[PDB]
From a paper:
In addition to dimers, the 2D averaging also indicated the presence of a small percentage of tetrameric SlNRC2. Further analysis was then conducted on a subset of 611,661 particles for the dimer and 159,294 particles for the tetramer, resulting in a cryo-EM density map with resolutions of 2.84 and 3.17 Å, respectively. In the cryo-EM structure of tetrameric SlNRC2, the interaction between two dimers (SlNRC2A–SlNRC2B and SlNRC2A′–SlNRC2B′) is mediated through ‘back-to-back’ contact between SlNRC2B and SlNRC2A′. One lateral side of the LRR domain of SlNRC2A′ contacts the coiled-coil domain of SlNRC2B. This interaction can serve to stabilize the coiled-coil domain which is not well defined in the dimeric SlNRC2. SlNRC2A′ Tyr739 is in packing contact with the side chains of SlNRC2B Met14, Arg18 and Glu32. The carbonyl oxygen of SlNRC2A′ Thr743 hydrogen bonds to SlNRC2B Arg18. The symmetrical packing of the LRR domains of SlNRC2B and SlNRC2A′ further enhances the interaction of the two SlNRC2 dimers. The stacking of two loop-out regions dominantly contributes to the symmetrical interaction around this interface. In addition, SlNRC2 oligomerization may lead to sequestration of the signalling coiled-coil domain, which is disordered in dimeric SlNRC2.
Author numbering:
A (entry chain E), B (entry chain A): 1 to 885
The structure:
Amino acid sequence: MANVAVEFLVENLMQLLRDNVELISGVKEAAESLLQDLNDFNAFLKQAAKCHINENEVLRELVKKIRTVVNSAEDAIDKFVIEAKLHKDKGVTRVLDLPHYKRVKEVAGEIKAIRNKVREIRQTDAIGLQALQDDDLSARGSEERKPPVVEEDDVVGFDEEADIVINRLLGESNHLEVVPVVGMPGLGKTTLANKIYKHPKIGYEFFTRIWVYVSQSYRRRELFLNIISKFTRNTKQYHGMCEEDLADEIQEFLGKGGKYLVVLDDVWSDEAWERIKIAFPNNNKPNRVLLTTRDSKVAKQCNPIPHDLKFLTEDESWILLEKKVFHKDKCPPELVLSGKSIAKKCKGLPLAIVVIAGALIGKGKTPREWKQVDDSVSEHLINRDHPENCNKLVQMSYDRLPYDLKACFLYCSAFPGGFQIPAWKLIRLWIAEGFIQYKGHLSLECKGEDNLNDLINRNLVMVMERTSDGQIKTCRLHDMLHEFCRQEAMKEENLFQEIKLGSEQYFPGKRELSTYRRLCIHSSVLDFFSTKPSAEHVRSFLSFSSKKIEMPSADIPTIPKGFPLLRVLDVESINFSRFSREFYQLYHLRYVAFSSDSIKILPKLMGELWNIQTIIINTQQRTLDIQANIWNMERLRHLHTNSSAKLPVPVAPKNSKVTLVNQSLQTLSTIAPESCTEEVFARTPNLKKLGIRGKISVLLDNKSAASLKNVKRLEYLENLKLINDSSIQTSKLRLPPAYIFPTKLRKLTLLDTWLEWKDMSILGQLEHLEVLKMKENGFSGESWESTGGFCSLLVLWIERTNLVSWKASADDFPRLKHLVLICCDNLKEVPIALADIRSFQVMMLQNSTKTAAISARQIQAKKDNQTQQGTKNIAFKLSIFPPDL
Amino acid sequence: MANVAVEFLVENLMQLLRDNVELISGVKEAAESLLQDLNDFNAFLKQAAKCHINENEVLRELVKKIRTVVNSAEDAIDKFVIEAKLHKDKGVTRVLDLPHYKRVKEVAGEIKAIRNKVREIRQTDAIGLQALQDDDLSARGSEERKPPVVEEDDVVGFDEEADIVINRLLGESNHLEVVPVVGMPGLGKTTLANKIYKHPKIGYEFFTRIWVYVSQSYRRRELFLNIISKFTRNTKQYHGMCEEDLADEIQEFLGKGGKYLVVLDDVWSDEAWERIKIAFPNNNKPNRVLLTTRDSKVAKQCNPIPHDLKFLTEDESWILLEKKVFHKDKCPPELVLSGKSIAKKCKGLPLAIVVIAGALIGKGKTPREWKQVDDSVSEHLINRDHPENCNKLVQMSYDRLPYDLKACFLYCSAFPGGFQIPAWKLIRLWIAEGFIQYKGHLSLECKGEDNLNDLINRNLVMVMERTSDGQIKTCRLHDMLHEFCRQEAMKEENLFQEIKLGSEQYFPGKRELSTYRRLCIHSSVLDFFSTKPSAEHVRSFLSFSSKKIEMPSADIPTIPKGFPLLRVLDVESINFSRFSREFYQLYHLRYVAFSSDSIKILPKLMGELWNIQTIIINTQQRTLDIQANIWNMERLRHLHTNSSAKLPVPVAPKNSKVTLVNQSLQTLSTIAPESCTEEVFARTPNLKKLGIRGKISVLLDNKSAASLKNVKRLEYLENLKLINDSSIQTSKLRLPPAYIFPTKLRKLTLLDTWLEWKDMSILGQLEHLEVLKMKENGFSGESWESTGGFCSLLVLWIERTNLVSWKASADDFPRLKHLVLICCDNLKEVPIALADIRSFQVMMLQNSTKTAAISARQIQAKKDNQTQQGTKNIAFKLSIFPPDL
Ligand SMILES: O=P(O)(O)O[C@H]1[C@@H](OP(=O)(O)O)[C@@H](OP(=O)(O)O)[C@@H](OP(=O)(O)O)[C@@H](OP(=O)(O)O)[C@@H]1OP(=O)(O)O
Ligand SMILES: O=P(O)(O)O[C@H]1[C@H](OP(=O)(O)O)[C@@H](OP(=O)(O)O)[C@H](OP(=O)(O)O)[C@@H](OP(=O)(O)O)[C@H]1OP(=O)(O)O
Ligand SMILES: Nc1ncnc2c1ncn2[C@@H]1O[C@H](COP(=O)(O)OP(=O)(O)O)[C@@H](O)[C@H]1O
Ligand SMILES: Nc1ncnc2c1ncn2[C@@H]1O[C@H](COP(=O)(O)OP(=O)(O)O)[C@@H](O)[C@H]1O
């Protein structure tokens, strides 16, 4: 939508005028003029949006060229800004910088012609404003939306295929067999196969169970490395071994672990199965493979008997729609006939019905909306076999979205097919692109999380992984939605364009690449950069690859010089050895991610990019030294890192009264303990997440820095992590008293502190802490005895400890819901008093002593009797690692 | 509740341990013990609150003797803190200074005996936990509450008595006659009388109309000063007059305004009417006065025929109940029988029904709750005429309130009966008393406002005046609610104690005062301070008088020396010549208000008080100079003033890296223009309100306009005020461009800037501004022509300008709701296009030309025609203050 670009340009111009007067100084009148005209433009596009522009040709004619004239302005202003900052570097103290001030004033001549153009067009727009304001529709207020807790996890009317499949498997002893499943896209082969892979009988039967996704763009060796990973810890060794030997190693590991069930998803080409099957050892055991698909030929080839999936009958259809649109509550009677007619209109496709329930949630729950939706569906599914019917249905759902979500959905279609989207990165990309604008009081990140939850609710985006906290950790887009969104973006809106290279084709020429605004290259990238492209109007550049590619020493300069107007640059999948000066000459850079293996210092010139919001760095060295004045970069909001970062020593200005305290700074992913000082925390009042890697001892000792005591100043801090990199128990470490920590702290992580279990009382004293995660021998001992305090703790996580005896009472953990016990191969039993807590719902116990498993089964039987006893308890689910136990 | 005191002590001790380590260095061990013990008792009392406490004597014994212990600990800790801070001022560098640290360390010995007693209680209270694990009631989640828009403005079934009285009045023209009304308290005499005083016929008949609330606590001379103020512009002439001459002057002015209707409310004693009546000139006019009362005797005395009021019948009863509990929606059928049974039991009392509707909102909308409240209301209204039948019903409603709202509702009875509570001050007092504890993300002020709205919703608190923008401005409690709350506080909770000098009340001795925790003296207070009281354990002190009382030069030491442990101190009704040296040793002072007439400097000693949150200074000087280090005091949240305040020049610590940036500061009432600087605005990031009184020229001068340009830096600023004191139009003033102002600014006020009307284009560009108030010739000119831009402006307020011509179109102000036009004595036209704006609903026009009134009547006719045309328009109310216009 043109509104997005208009708003972003207005905001950036305002920020540049307020903040940096000197750069814009030669053209201030033109800046203010463009500001007024863009405000008026935005109002006009809103008024046009109120109407159905597609209904009138004149309205559609009017919108065109609103966007091009706006685009011409953005270009001229940005070129001017970069030119004048280069002038500042020139340091021409001449009063009249006649040489090359006439170049920045050539850009200003373009600016002036552009201001003249914008003054025009605005006069024509004033014509037809009154006529447009005569008409309006959908005059209503805005309501709230609510978080997407799990709902309808049960699968309507699909027990039949589940039981048939679970029956078929385990037929012939000592045979490696494959179970094909087919059925048109959106039917639910993955959903049913998930229900199988999570049915109790399957987990009872086979010990090893691997979930594997194999699309068309799948890679064989990438898959083998990960499957070997399922068994062992490190794959960096097998980065240097052949696929065949890798196939052999997977075979040995998989054969060792008794039986095995392996799931490969959405296969496309029979040769794909032919190649992948090698790793599986046919060692004369009843091991079952479960592949699903869409094409019939491959299913038939891999086994002469494919099990075809089934459509949902009319009743299943209506019940499913009722569930999705009305969630737990039951439908009010008046809409029943409408909903049943729509369900019948669907023909029993779970995908069409699901998206339609999303559209109904979007419209409302009033009879007029239901009748209109019924009429529209009765029109857009006249055929069955044509997939574009699903596209028409999704378009109908899509039309009702707010334009802000319209931008986010398309931009979520940017990622490659089959790629699992990291939610935090997706939110930060949305922020840096300008799709989320200040409205209200929520922090930008919270608004982004709410937007993602909204998109999940109407069933456009399917969630894949969730956190311990219950939040979302990784999402993606179903194939049909990906195709519809990609076509809509690359064709209509020109949001972005992709450059995947088919056989016997060439990367476009400079004239074509001239008309792009964003690039995505998810295929051979070094090949596009060996050509030395040049497109002055590329603002973003995305490359979400699978492997890590090295960048040749003679090829580093190409990105900075080819695209001198970047804003977003995510090349996390490309490893750099260094950087060139043109890099530090990129002055519009907002988002910047990159990897590296020999980087140790963040050069100081990097602090001259005065618009950076986000920074993400990967480095193999333990210590990363930062020399750029991050206290100078006003708008910095995040600084991620995987090594231990050594922040610079802060100094306030001497001749300037102004103090350097960043109000908008929310993260310091991993800083060294040496910098956990009073001043570092004086400068970050609003900090919400902090991490410290290094030798946690320096913190805990009270000589060098009362560092844990320094932590008291961060009032809003809500997440902390203590990572120790020393591998030597030089002394014993002691946590300070529980009045030093912040009050809202909600999630803590320890790793190799090696603390004594008596200190757990201090943590019990904390009030709001909701998740405790101690990994890799965080607390050392053999005797912990609960002493109360964990009033609100919701998830407990213990991994790689030598604890033996634990003792508690049902009043120690009143709100427990989740309990994680990993790699505790020296614990004996879990206290049974944990079976008394009502909310205790999920437990898991990995690589643990079998006596603990027997006690856990006792606890499960206890809670089963409780729920049987008429209490309104939440259902009980257990998990014990041993297949036998 | 004991919970609130427990929590406040815990929080204060935590803050003391964190920030001031040295003060509590000698006792930190007892301090930490006590801190853990107080957390344990907080949890204990929560569990006790789960099980019913009112009904059980064992519980009401157990809870006692914990409060005594916490109070003893509080007193010991506070005495320790004061003596140790005096030790800091002593500056004894001796390693071992026994004198006055032996007595301080034996104050720590008292602390140690108290910690021992707390340990004993800890051991004892653990006994008796077994029963608490058994019992728990009202286990449920918390939902949201919504802001109080007007509900049931219309009065159910009262129209008939309004008819009788409106018909009754005006019968014998040319006579001064009083109209009494009688009907038991809580029946609605003032509701009906307000309905009359706002009936169109009344305003049409009489020109002048006055509202004057009266009560037993009335004061005549104040009444007249108020009665004459309503007519006059300057009260200076009448201030030094005699009460009889006050009567004379009110007589003359009341005669000037032709006829008149005067309303006097809740007259108690005939002597009152006899003493008041002289001021009314019985000038042989058809003038009317309206009295209402709860007593028959005085009503008979005033006139031999009082019109006794009626009770609501059953239908009106149930109608009122459904209205109050369901607002604009209709009751679900199942609850109809219950609601009607309750309404019938209520006998027809509007107050009983209103309170029961409030209780029903509080509980829920489910049949079990309705049956419960029904079976309880049948139980508590056995008698009829008697008042206590009402008190019991309030008890039923009040029982369900959260323990947080119970404290605030009780604390609202501190104010003397018949006092209109200033809402902002009330919220600030609640904050300083610790009643509102940080919960969530809302600012403390927002949480307080929400709490007040909640209290209003249940119909416990009656609103009196609202602001321009629709918010609350002052409130009060109905008499019976005040009596119930007063007894409940003074007797059961010992929340506070009043000392009302009756004809036979005489000031308690030192022993009795040894037991109070808070005082309220709303009577002669100089008389109480002539006695030189002494009570170490008084924490608050409140005196909300109506007059201003000057403090004798010999009694300024009495407040500090008598009460050396003060926390809150509101004596805004007592003028101070100066402050004695003990004021600067009230180190616990959080809230401090006072007045003055000769103060010009806040001496630097004031900055030594490290806990001050709020400061209110009401000085008659034109300029107030501040020398206390505002940047040193860390918890400062507000600073209110009358004179152009001249803040000190900021300085950073030379030898310390610390930066003096207050995150909590949120107000500066009237700063001097000279101090507005980037140095100051750098220190106050979250500032939300700013005011600048002085010579606005320095600001608005484009050459020195760097001032408002500095104002550009406050991101969250939401309210700004420009007040000019100079009476000389020395030059013409121009607003800087609209990209300098913050983006969220919602309300602007100008006063004597004398700006050209062409500049209103700048203010049009601002997007979110919702209320514009220009007073006392803000914008000067004779020709303003609207140029669009006021996208979201809701109220327009023009006062005392020589504008003559105004031109606009219905697209100029799309969202206007209320238009205020006062003292515009030279306007000739009100563009008719304002009648095409649907949002426009209330209009006003005061001291304006007749042609404007004609145009306004045409506008009302137009909107009436529109609403007649089937459009869903919000009903239109027009008002011209002088009816003959
Ligand atoms: O807050 P309000 O209830 O709306 O009172 C406002 C205003 O207050 P704000 O602009 O800060 O909101 C002023 O009250 P104070 O700020 O001084 O406390 C005062 O006008 P001045 O700026 O000239 O002081 C005037 O109240 P009053 O009529 O008692 O003088 C006015 O009243 P409104 O409520 O009608 O806006
Ligand atoms: O499950 P989560 O709720 O995501 O919690 C953590 C955490 O994530 P958050 O701090 O954002 O909540 C870590 O995030 P990052 O370190 O990448 O910033 C991540 O990595 P760490 O191991 O270093 O904590 C870790 O993932 P994992 O432990 O698997 O590596 C993950 O916990 P999960 O195990 O559930 O992913
Ligand atoms: N039996 C079912 N009941 C309700 N919804 C279903 C069912 N089966 C699939 N879905 C819906 O279909 C989507 C899952 O996609 P899916 O059909 O498994 O992809 P494919 O079948 O193409 O591999 C989800 O939105 C899910 O809610
Ligand atoms: N029909 C009604 N008559 C009188 N009061 C009503 C009615 N409906 C609601 N109320 C509410 O009852 C409250 C108490 O009445 P009020 O007029 O204060 O008592 P009184 O006039 O007897 O002192 C008022 O705030 C009013 O809003």
